[PDB]
Design a protein around this ligand. Structure first.
Ligand SMILES: *CCS(=O)(=O)N(c1ccc(C(C)(C)C)cc1)[C@@H](C(=O)NC1CCCCC1)c1cccnc1
Ligand SMILES: *CCS(=O)(=O)N(c1ccc(C(C)(C)C)cc1)[C@@H](C(=O)NC1CCCCC1)c1cccnc1
Lengths: 304, 304
């Protein structure tokens, strides 16, 4: 019993975080095998941050320009290349602590653990979701860029996020580890605004199923509904359209609670139309949408 | 910028979790040096769980009765002793991964990271607080007992909590690692109820300071107040009395925001008396009290 925002164990990832310094800017890098990954804006000075030419900046630069430290260990740079918005530093030493790892590009609504780091040193771990506008509401201070988001599947670490920047909004944008930004963000000091943030409807339903599983079931109504009828009310409150994919994915939770997906959709409709009236669900006065159906299954099943 | 429920990196602790089996019951144990710590109710059968005599149950038991596994590694038990509600198993092999560790008994309101485990295998990490009634609202399924709560100070792991039981309430009770329960809980299947849970006032103030630091400052009023005047309204809403200790501890946050502790107390009073009116603070429609002043400082400072 109980339901909490739960992050994956960070142990496998802790051993992969290095410090990358290039002149004045210092940030975090990911050391996997004989390659160190970090945001390419490590080569920028506050002069060039307004509209940098990264290809031209990287040309004015050789291996020994870049300083990599793993604690009290200095790594020799054997090569540098730019992959989109990510710098790849080839180093002499393979990381002895390199886990079985994949690079994955996650979809909006999917969740991952962030190991927040400063000077290649892990400070904390928290769970967060890829917002539909391809931002994340994370916790990053200066020097946090190069902090990575990841999932653990079996013994295999899926790296899905590398932190690059804060938008004047105060929310966060980053890349997959192939250096492609999530959303339409560029690595320059320019007027960038995220789109209308919608609510991840399939995640809220997952969270309501978690509430039912943990005895909190006051919001359960005596109605049902249809996808069409529901999606009309979803659009109204800036909720993501609910798909036949999403109903299928909620099947396990539906089966274990004996509450049909459409019945829970009717219960959600009433909450959107009538609010909570000072009531709480799993000790939240708001509807939570940063839990996937898989997050809820894991925590309500007991998956290692 | 940004503010999240952040757990410590779990890496140092991941390497200390073993599986302890004694007959039918299997749970988690903590392997530090040549000692394995686990809840003593591993020696119980559902026969004796109603009113066990643990001294008499432990007497009907020798070293080879207890099965300890570190993955695919079976440890020889050289000794067993009972320390209050904790079993201590002396083993042949010292844990090579044992970190610098302390056992601390934390005070109500203090926070710690929980590494939730099943079969000595870490499943997830989350932050939680010692409630004033000495319970925690955690996330534990069957087989989670022996899961530990900890803080990281410098490179030193402070173990403060070992999970023992769920109360019919659905909240959790456990011990320090010297086997003394937090609160008045006993390790038997009996009608145990936690006391009136109060709100950790000093934590809510810390959280409001975090809100101000992250630009969310609509609730800031044009009044001030006194400890006495405030404590009268605190008692009314089941909030913990605010001490001259607590005001001193909030000093750093007061200094950095330029908001006197008593001004923030006046802002809190209005929220308690008038509610939020459908507004949010750091994206919560409720007042959060599971962040200490030190948690807020760490996350708003950048402490590794
Ligand atoms: C990653 C931390 S940072 O301090 O390096 N940082 C940052 C500065 C400049 C860039 C460029 C891409 C422009 C070279 C990236 C990242 C800041 C940050 O995002 N600053 C922005 C600049 C635009 C206006 C809003 C602030 C940062 C601060 C806190 C957390 N992450 C990043
Ligand atoms: C620790 C998990 S458990 O399944 O072993 N567990 C538990 C059962 C019995 C005990 C005794 C102390 C009575 C021997 C302790 C722990 C349960 C649990 O707490 N069960 C209680 C029994 C009283 C009535 C409410 C349930 C447990 C379940 C989920 C999470 N933690 C513990």
């Amino acid at each position: 019993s109980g339901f909490r925002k739960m992050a994956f164990p960070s142990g496998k990832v802790e051993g992969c975080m290095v410090q990358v310094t290039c002149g004045t800017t210092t940030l975090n890098g990911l050391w996997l095998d004989d390659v160190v990954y970090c945001p390419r804006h490590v080569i920028c000075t506050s002069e060039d941050m307004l509209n940098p030419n990264y290809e031209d900046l990287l040309i004015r630069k050789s291996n020994h320009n870049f300083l990599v430290q793993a604690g009290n260990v200095q790594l020799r740079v054997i090569g540098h290349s730019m992959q989109n918005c990510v710098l790849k530093l080839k180093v002499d030493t393979a990381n002895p602590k390199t886990p079985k790892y994949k690079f994955v590009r996650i979809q909006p609504g999917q969740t991952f653990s962030v190991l927040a780091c400063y000077n290649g040193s892990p400070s904390g771990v928290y769970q967060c979701a890829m917002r539909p506008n391809f931002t994340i509401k994370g916790s990053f201070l200066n020097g946090s860029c190069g902090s990575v988001g990841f999932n653990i599947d079996y013994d295999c670490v899926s790296f899905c996020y590398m932190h690059h920047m804060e938008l004047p909004t105060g929310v966060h944008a980053g890349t997959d580890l192939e250096g492609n930004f999530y959303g339409p963000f560029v690595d320059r000091q320019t007027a960038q605004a995220a789109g209308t943030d919608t609510t991840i409807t399939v995640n809220v339903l997952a969270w309501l199923y978690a509430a039912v599983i943990n005895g909190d079931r006051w919001f359960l109504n005596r109605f049902t509904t249809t996808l069409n009828d529901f999606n009309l009310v979803a659009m109204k409150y800036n909720y993501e359209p609910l798909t036949q994919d999403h109903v299928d994915i909620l099947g396990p939770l539906s089966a274990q609670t004996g509450i049909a997906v459409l019945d829970m959709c009717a219960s959600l409709k009433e909450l959107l139309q009538n609010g909570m009236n000072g009531r709480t669900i799993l000790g939240s006065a708001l509807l939570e949408d940063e839990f996937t159906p898989f997050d809820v299954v894991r925590q309500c099943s007991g998956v290692t």
